[PDB]
Every structure is written in C-alpha cells, then in structure tokens.
Amino acid sequence: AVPSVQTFGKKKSATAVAHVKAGKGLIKVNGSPITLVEPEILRFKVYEPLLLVGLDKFSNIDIRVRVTGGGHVSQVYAIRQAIAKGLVAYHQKYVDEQSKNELKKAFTSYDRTLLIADSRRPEPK
Amino acid sequence: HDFAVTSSTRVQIFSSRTRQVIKTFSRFKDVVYSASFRSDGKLLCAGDATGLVSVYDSYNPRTILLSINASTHPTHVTKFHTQDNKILATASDDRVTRLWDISNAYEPQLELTGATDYVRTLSFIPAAPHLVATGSYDGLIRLYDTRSSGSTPI
Amino acid sequence: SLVVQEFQHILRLLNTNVDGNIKIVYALTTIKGVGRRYSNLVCKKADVDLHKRAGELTQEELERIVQIMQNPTHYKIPAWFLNHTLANNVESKLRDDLERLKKIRXXXXXXXX
Amino acid sequence: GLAEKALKALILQCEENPSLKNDKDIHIIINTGKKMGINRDNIPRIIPLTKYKLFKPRDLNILLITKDPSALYRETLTKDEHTSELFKEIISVKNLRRRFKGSKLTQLYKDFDLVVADYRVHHLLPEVLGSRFYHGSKKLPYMIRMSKEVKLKRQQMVEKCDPIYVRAQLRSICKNTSYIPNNDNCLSVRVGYIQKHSIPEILQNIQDTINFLTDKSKRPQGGVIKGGIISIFVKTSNSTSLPIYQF
Amino acid sequence: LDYVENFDSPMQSALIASSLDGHVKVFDPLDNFQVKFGWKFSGPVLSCAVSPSTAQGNRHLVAGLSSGLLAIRTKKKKSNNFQRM
RNA sequence: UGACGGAGCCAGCGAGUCUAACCUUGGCCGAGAGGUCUUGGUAAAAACUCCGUCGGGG
Structure with a gap:
C-alpha cells in the first residue's frame, strides 16, 4: 500500500486520530475540510501548525482526522495536536529527519502543547 | 457597489x-x-x-458605534474628510461648523465659527487638508483654515 | 427656493395613547388584546407600510385601521390572534383538623400553651 | 322521528345542568352487533358532510408538525397568502420533542384546539406529544398531505409543498367530522356543536354520518360498519347516551 | 450637485446638478461647463448623485425627488484526452 | 450581559423478562367476577457559535 503514519491527540476528554499519507495536499476532519471548523474563532488555532511550518510542507501530504468526545475548545485543541504530531511523524519516517528536527524546533519554540499534551494533573499541598 | x-x-x-x-x-x-x-x-x-x-x-x-452630541440645533450636513480618515465635520442651524476627531467624541477639536446664517453644505478640497470650504444660506461662500486658529475665513 | 412637502405627537385609538416615535408594527403592540404577529397581519390588510411611523399615515386612514380593529368578525379576519374564598375554607377546615389532632394525641399540646 | 325530541332535551339540559355547563361538543356513538375487525390505530379517517359545513378553518387554533429540516415547509405556507392567516404555529418534530416536554404538553393541549401533522412523521408522534392527547378524539392528530405527488420504489423523494392544495385539505378537514376505527363495536363521532347550529342541522348531520358509515360500497374509507347498526346514542362528553334508532 | 472625474466616458469628467424642476443636467469642465444632457423626472428633485469613478460594474444615477421617489437610472454591463489530443 | 424564532455541531457516567399515573362519562358482553371498546378532566445535552426579527409590580 501507500506510505502511512498515525498519531494521537488528547485534550480533557477529546481524542484525535490523524492518519498521514502521501497524496495531493488535502486536509480533512470528520469528512469535512479544514475551512469548516464550527467554533469559528478557533479555526485559526487549527491552521496554527499549518502556518508555522509553511504550507509547502503540506502540499504533498494528506491528513484525515477523526475526533470524538470533549466539547468545542477541547476538540479543536485535539486536532491541532494530531496534525502537528502527524506532520512530524511523517517526516521522521519517510522524509528527512533534519527536516523533522526543524519541524519539531519550530513547534517547541512556539508552544509545547502542539507536540505533547501536558496532563493537567491534580496536586495536593 | x-x-x-x-x-x-x-x-x-x-x-x-x-x-x-x-x-x-x-x-x-x-x-x-x-x-x-x-x-x-x-x-x-x-x-x-x-x-x-x-x-x-x-x-x-x-x-x-458613536453618537456625538452637537449643539441643540439640528445638524443639516455631516461630512467626513476626504484625504483624512479620522475627522468629522458637521454643520448645524446654530451657524457654526465643528470639526470632531472621532477619538474625542465629546469636545470639538476646532469650533469653526464666523458663519452668517444656516450653513447647510460644506466640502473639503483634495489638494490641501488644512482648507475647508463652507457654504452658508445667504451667499458668502466661506473658505476656512483649520491649521490656523479657525474662527474667521481666509 | 420653496419645496412642497407632506407629522404629529401621541395619538389615541380607542382609549389607547400610543407614542408617535416607533413604527406601527410595534406601536400597536401596546394596545391591550393585540398580539405582535397580529399587527403584521392587520397592517397589510389595511394597506399601510410596515416600517413607517404613526406620526404620518393621516387620520382618515388611521380611523380606517381602527375600524378594522373593533369589528374583526366581518372582514374575514380570524379571531384566534386574540386572547378567592375557595382557598379560605379549605385551610380553615384543616385548621380544626390539626387542632383536634393535637387534642387526639396526648403529646402535641405545647405550642404557645 | 324522536331524534329531534332527543336533541331537544339534550340541548335544554346542557345550558341548565351545572355539571354540563362546560362541554360544548356533541357525540353520537354507534354500537353494532358484530365487531369490526380493524384494531385501533391513531390515524383518524374523516368523513364528509354533504350539506352543512361544521367549522370554517379560521376559528380553530391549528398546530402543524412537519419534517426535521422544515425550512421551506415553514417558508412557503407562511408567505403564500392562501394559508398565511390560517396556520397558528409550525413546529418541526425534533424541535417539538426538544422544546415542549414535561408538563408543558398540558398547556399545549389547552391553548391549541386542533393538531394536524403530515403523513411522514405522524406515526412518530405519540411518544413525543403525550398520552393526554390520546384520551379520546378531541385533539387526536389529524392528517394532511404535503406535496400532491407520490413516491415509487427506489425513486428519490422530490420535496414540494403546494399551499393551495394543503389549504383545501384543511378546508376539507375542518368542515366535517372524523371517525377512528376500533376493535370492539362502540365507536363515537363528534357531529355538530351546541351553538354553531341547531337541531335540524344536527339531524341531517346524523343522517349523512350513518349513510357514509353503512355504505357497503366505497370500502377503504367508508366500509367500516358491516351488517347493520344496532343502535345510535346521542351524547355530550359528560351527559348520558340518549337512545335513537332502536333497530 | 455631484461631481465625478476620470470615469469611463467620452469626456474626462462630468458635473451633474439637480435643478428643482425635475431636471438633472450634466456639465463638463473642459467644455466651459456647458449643458450636454438632461433627464426629466415628474416632481422636483432635491438630491442628485452618480456612482463614483471606480465602480467596475453597472453604474447608477440616483436622483431623489420631493414626492418621496427614488429614481434609479442604471447603465448595465472537452475530455482531458482531447486536450492532450 | 434582553426578547423572538431559525439553523450549526460537541460529551461522559448509565440498561436485573427490568422502566413506572390518578379521577370520570358511557355502550356491548357476562349469572357474577370482570372483560372489551367510548369519552372528558387532573398531574408529569445545555452552554456556545451563527442567522435574521426586534430598542417598573398587581
């Protein structure tokens, strides 16, 4: 079959399953494209790993994300994690890893939640 | 459109x-x-x-967005500046024109006076931003300067 | 230098004092017995403009609207847009109920006594 | 015969008896010898009244339950001016379940005097509209078509709503009365009203009702009472069943 | 009175004016402000306006009369193997 | 930080052959018990986004 790679994202009770395969440069979430994210103010939070990396690095990859659980804010944060993990897991497997290293550095210089999700764990004093 | x-x-x-x-x-x-x-x-x-x-x-x-309180007389013409994009010029039946910067919508930046009776149409001039044309209702087409003190036509 | 033109203050329509500042599709809503969507029906039956104030719309046709109002049955307008001592006895007949129950029970006899 | 006399004493007492001061509907009930075999569904079959119209549809509160998208069902019937002053309020079935739930079905029963739904979602109704409506046939949900075109096997449903023809149905459904078929013999039809008309109007309403119900031809809407009617009993909703047509 | 410059026209600029006789008359400053064309409406006109120079579409003449009338006069405006064939 | 409708879509803990009203008007059948039908009264995901319509208490 075609090359593929699969990552996971996690906010409070919302999970994201993103599959990244070689293709025509199309971006899909739940069948719908990315220009139809319903919270409508957080739509720039899911374009956010797209525009930090430059749109040329998504021109030949495909992204298909399912999301279940959570609400609205927790769902959008799951999509931006799974896209950013899905891009950086494709590039560590079939593309240059120095490309992966510059892709990873461009995310952790911005924000750590795009790569791994900090579990907001309780603490007793 | x-x-x-x-x-x-x-x-x-x-x-x-x-x-x-x-x-x-x-x-x-x-x-x-x-x-x-x-x-x-x-x-x-x-x-x-x-x-x-x-x-x-x-x-x-x-x-x-904004409701500037002018004088209690009715205001016949309210025109915006052509070259500038932040200053409103209004007239009234109170025989005075006022130039309001919309940042300060409570006090007039330049109370342009000297009119005779019922200024009902005014216009700007596209070359000079300091020059404001003002037409009363008795003839006497006033030409005003806002870079100066602005209380008497040139 | 003359122009030929074509307003008033508050008006009465069968003892309903209505202001002349808002348009008639919501001005008639202050009249008792008149619904909101009933006003949009009765205005278009009376051939007026819906976004138009009550200061205009002259009194010869303002009386024409209010006669559509007071007789709704004959102008083919449907009428479905339109509209104690029994608590005194029932508690007092349970007051003696709790009073004799305090008499019946040999414990409940120390309210204000 | 004595049907005029039976209606005379019923009309006289209903404005005089303190218990009967509130019931305004008049029912004839029919008990037959044999039991008609069709069990009680909840789609009311209506019958015509060929001479005297019962109600005109501009004095009844009419609620319509439509399909889930409900955009052009709402839009066309509100802005056609054939039905614009006819329908009281239009609700989608999913929004009716979500909004009106609990004790608010009681005020929906009291305020709105007649309920009608399309043939699409009428079977889904009794679990969202409540058991208060299905206590007799006062506000039993009636029937309307919506499109005046049929669906064959594997054909895509073409959506259409003609307001003139669905207005003519509500003209055809408020002008007369309806029967709901039952397993046992006793079925009741609401013929006439106390103050809409009078005794000779009710009398030929009785005659046209028993003519349609005993029609041996015209099977699927009319051939319900078979053999012969044993008796008929005129009543209000709280009065006694006064006897006529003994054999 | 309204004025438009450098709009797509056989002249460079056009100056229009409402006359309170139903007449809106156009003038051009290059031809010593002489009258070129005049439309006539029913009632007297209190407001006259034309679309600006950069409409890129249907241009409009909007004239407003005393009798509550807005007169609008508008100038309007296979297979992929066979392409590789 | 309103009202009125109309769309948009997001959850997790739940599932014992266990899940759940009362009062009344009658008709027919039955020796009764009651059964069947009739009738009327009484009680019983949100948020958010978006689209338009709206601008003192008895």
Missing part, C-alpha cells in the same frame, strides 16, 4: 447589483438629514434633526 439614501428617520443602504434595499437604519428620534460615507468606506455619518449626530459602521444597523 452601495449608495445611502436618506428619508424620514431612516437611512437605507441600497445595492449597485440588485438595486434593492440591503439594510435600513431606524434608530432615530427626529428626521435624519445627511448620511455621508467615509473615504475608507467603513463608517457612515447620520446627521439628525434632534441635535446630536450618530456615526456607525456600514452594513450594520445593530452596532451604533
């Missing part, structure tokens, strides 16, 4: 394509006299006969 037409207490925005009523502005106590768009096209004036002028955003009757 739009033009504003004034009426009894209702400035309605039309269309150039459909030539039909897009929106209506029905937030007026007395009759609205003038309605001039700015050169940016975002914000349109509405001079009201009750005394105070209201300027808000185009294509939005809901958000009354």
Whole structure:
C-alpha cells in the first residue's frame, strides 16, 4: 500500500486520530475540510501548525482526522495536536529527519502543547 | 457597489447589483438629514434633526458605534474628510461648523465659527487638508483654515 | 427656493395613547388584546407600510385601521390572534383538623400553651 | 322521528345542568352487533358532510408538525397568502420533542384546539406529544398531505409543498367530522356543536354520518360498519347516551 | 450637485446638478461647463448623485425627488484526452 | 450581559423478562367476577457559535 503514519491527540476528554499519507495536499476532519471548523474563532488555532511550518510542507501530504468526545475548545485543541504530531511523524519516517528536527524546533519554540499534551494533573499541598 | 439614501428617520443602504434595499437604519428620534460615507468606506455619518449626530459602521444597523452630541440645533450636513480618515465635520442651524476627531467624541477639536446664517453644505478640497470650504444660506461662500486658529475665513 | 412637502405627537385609538416615535408594527403592540404577529397581519390588510411611523399615515386612514380593529368578525379576519374564598375554607377546615389532632394525641399540646 | 325530541332535551339540559355547563361538543356513538375487525390505530379517517359545513378553518387554533429540516415547509405556507392567516404555529418534530416536554404538553393541549401533522412523521408522534392527547378524539392528530405527488420504489423523494392544495385539505378537514376505527363495536363521532347550529342541522348531520358509515360500497374509507347498526346514542362528553334508532 | 472625474466616458469628467424642476443636467469642465444632457423626472428633485469613478460594474444615477421617489437610472454591463489530443 | 424564532455541531457516567399515573362519562358482553371498546378532566445535552426579527409590580 501507500506510505502511512498515525498519531494521537488528547485534550480533557477529546481524542484525535490523524492518519498521514502521501497524496495531493488535502486536509480533512470528520469528512469535512479544514475551512469548516464550527467554533469559528478557533479555526485559526487549527491552521496554527499549518502556518508555522509553511504550507509547502503540506502540499504533498494528506491528513484525515477523526475526533470524538470533549466539547468545542477541547476538540479543536485535539486536532491541532494530531496534525502537528502527524506532520512530524511523517517526516521522521519517510522524509528527512533534519527536516523533522526543524519541524519539531519550530513547534517547541512556539508552544509545547502542539507536540505533547501536558496532563493537567491534580496536586495536593 | 452601495449608495445611502436618506428619508424620514431612516437611512437605507441600497445595492449597485440588485438595486434593492440591503439594510435600513431606524434608530432615530427626529428626521435624519445627511448620511455621508467615509473615504475608507467603513463608517457612515447620520446627521439628525434632534441635535446630536450618530456615526456607525456600514452594513450594520445593530452596532451604533458613536453618537456625538452637537449643539441643540439640528445638524443639516455631516461630512467626513476626504484625504483624512479620522475627522468629522458637521454643520448645524446654530451657524457654526465643528470639526470632531472621532477619538474625542465629546469636545470639538476646532469650533469653526464666523458663519452668517444656516450653513447647510460644506466640502473639503483634495489638494490641501488644512482648507475647508463652507457654504452658508445667504451667499458668502466661506473658505476656512483649520491649521490656523479657525474662527474667521481666509 | 420653496419645496412642497407632506407629522404629529401621541395619538389615541380607542382609549389607547400610543407614542408617535416607533413604527406601527410595534406601536400597536401596546394596545391591550393585540398580539405582535397580529399587527403584521392587520397592517397589510389595511394597506399601510410596515416600517413607517404613526406620526404620518393621516387620520382618515388611521380611523380606517381602527375600524378594522373593533369589528374583526366581518372582514374575514380570524379571531384566534386574540386572547378567592375557595382557598379560605379549605385551610380553615384543616385548621380544626390539626387542632383536634393535637387534642387526639396526648403529646402535641405545647405550642404557645 | 324522536331524534329531534332527543336533541331537544339534550340541548335544554346542557345550558341548565351545572355539571354540563362546560362541554360544548356533541357525540353520537354507534354500537353494532358484530365487531369490526380493524384494531385501533391513531390515524383518524374523516368523513364528509354533504350539506352543512361544521367549522370554517379560521376559528380553530391549528398546530402543524412537519419534517426535521422544515425550512421551506415553514417558508412557503407562511408567505403564500392562501394559508398565511390560517396556520397558528409550525413546529418541526425534533424541535417539538426538544422544546415542549414535561408538563408543558398540558398547556399545549389547552391553548391549541386542533393538531394536524403530515403523513411522514405522524406515526412518530405519540411518544413525543403525550398520552393526554390520546384520551379520546378531541385533539387526536389529524392528517394532511404535503406535496400532491407520490413516491415509487427506489425513486428519490422530490420535496414540494403546494399551499393551495394543503389549504383545501384543511378546508376539507375542518368542515366535517372524523371517525377512528376500533376493535370492539362502540365507536363515537363528534357531529355538530351546541351553538354553531341547531337541531335540524344536527339531524341531517346524523343522517349523512350513518349513510357514509353503512355504505357497503366505497370500502377503504367508508366500509367500516358491516351488517347493520344496532343502535345510535346521542351524547355530550359528560351527559348520558340518549337512545335513537332502536333497530 | 455631484461631481465625478476620470470615469469611463467620452469626456474626462462630468458635473451633474439637480435643478428643482425635475431636471438633472450634466456639465463638463473642459467644455466651459456647458449643458450636454438632461433627464426629466415628474416632481422636483432635491438630491442628485452618480456612482463614483471606480465602480467596475453597472453604474447608477440616483436622483431623489420631493414626492418621496427614488429614481434609479442604471447603465448595465472537452475530455482531458482531447486536450492532450 | 434582553426578547423572538431559525439553523450549526460537541460529551461522559448509565440498561436485573427490568422502566413506572390518578379521577370520570358511557355502550356491548357476562349469572357474577370482570372483560372489551367510548369519552372528558387532573398531574408529569445545555452552554456556545451563527442567522435574521426586534430598542417598573398587581
């Protein structure tokens, strides 16, 4: 079959399953494209790993994300994690890893939640 | 693609394509006299006969953005600056024109006086931003300077 | 330099004092017994403009609207847009109920006594 | 015969008896010898009244339950001016379940005097509209078509709503009365009203009702009572069943 | 009175004016402000306006009369193997 | 930080052959018990986004 790679994202009770395969440069979430994210103010939070990396690095990859659980804010944060993990897991497997290293550095210089999700764990004093 | 037409207490925005009523502005106590768009096209004036002028955003009757209280006389013409895009010039039946910066919508930046009777149309001049043409209702077409003290025509 | 033109203050329509500042599709809503959507029906039956104030719309046709109002049955207008001591006995007949129950029970006899 | 006399004493007492001061509907009930075999569904079959119209549809509160998208069902019937002054309020079935739930079905029963739904979602109704409506046949949900075109096998449903023809149905459904078929013999039809008309109007309403119900031809809407009617009993909703047509 | 410059026209600029006789008359400053064309409406006209120079579509003449009338006069405006064939 | 409708879509803990009203008007059948039908009265995901309509208490 075609090359593929699969990552996971996690906010409070919302999970994201993103599959990244070689293709025509199309971006899909739940069948719908990315220009139809319903919270409508957080739509720039899911374009956010797209525009930090430059749109040329998504021109030949495909992204298909399912999301279940959570609400609205927790769902959008799951999509931006799974896209950013899905891009950086494709590039560590079939593309240059120095490309992966510059892709990873461009995310952790911005924000750590795009790569791994900090579990907001309780603490007793 | 739009033009504003004034009426009894209702400035309605039309269309150039459909030539039909897009929106209506029905937030007026007395009759609205003038309605001039700015050169940016975002914000349109509405001079009201009750005394105070209201300027808000185009294509939005809901958000009354600004309501400057002029003198208690009715305001016949409220025009925006052509080269500048932040200063409103209004007239009144109080025989004075006022130049309001919309940052300070409570005190007039330059109370342009010296008119004889009933200034009802004024205009700007595209070369010089300091020069404001002002027309009264007895002849005597005033030409005013706002870089100067601005209380007597050149 | 003359122009030929064509307003008034508050008006009465069968003892209903209505202001002349808002348009008639919501001005008639202050009249008792009149619904909101009933006003949009009765205005278009009376051949007026819905976004138009009550200061205009002259009194010869203002009386024409209010006669549509007072006789709704004959102008083919449907009428479905339109509209104690029994608590005194029932508690007092349970007051003696709790009073005799305090008499019946040999414990409940110390309210304000 | 004595049907005029039976209606005379029923009309006289209903404005005089303190218990009967509130019931304004008149029912004839029919008990037959044999039991008609069709069990009680909840789709009311209506019958015509060929001479005297019962109600005109501009004096009844009419609730319509439509399909889930409900955009052009709402839009066309509100802005056609054939039905614009006819329908009281239009609700989609999913929004009716979500909004009106609990004790608010009681005020929906009291305020709105007649309920009608399309043939699409009428079977889904009794679990969202409540058991208060299905206590007899006062506000039993009636029937309307919506499109005046049929669906064959594997054909895509073409959506259409003609307001003139659905207005003519509500003209055809408020002008007369309806029967709901039952397993046992006793079925009741609401013929006439106390103050809409009078005794000779009710009398030929009785005659046209028993003519349609005993029609041996015209099977699927009319051939319900078989053999012969044993008796008929005129009543209000709280009165006694006064006897006529003994054999 | 309204004025438009450099719009797509056989002349460079046009100056229009409402006359309170139903007449809106156009003038051009290059031809010493002489009259070129005049439309006539029924009632007297209190407001006259034309579309600006950069409409890129149907241009409009909007004239407003005393009798509550807005007169609008408008100038309007296979297979992929066979392409590789 | 309103009202009125109309769309948009997001959850997790739940599932014992266990899940759940009362009063009344009658008709027919039955020796009764009651059964069947009739009738009327009484009680019983949100948020958010978006689209338009709207601008003192008895």
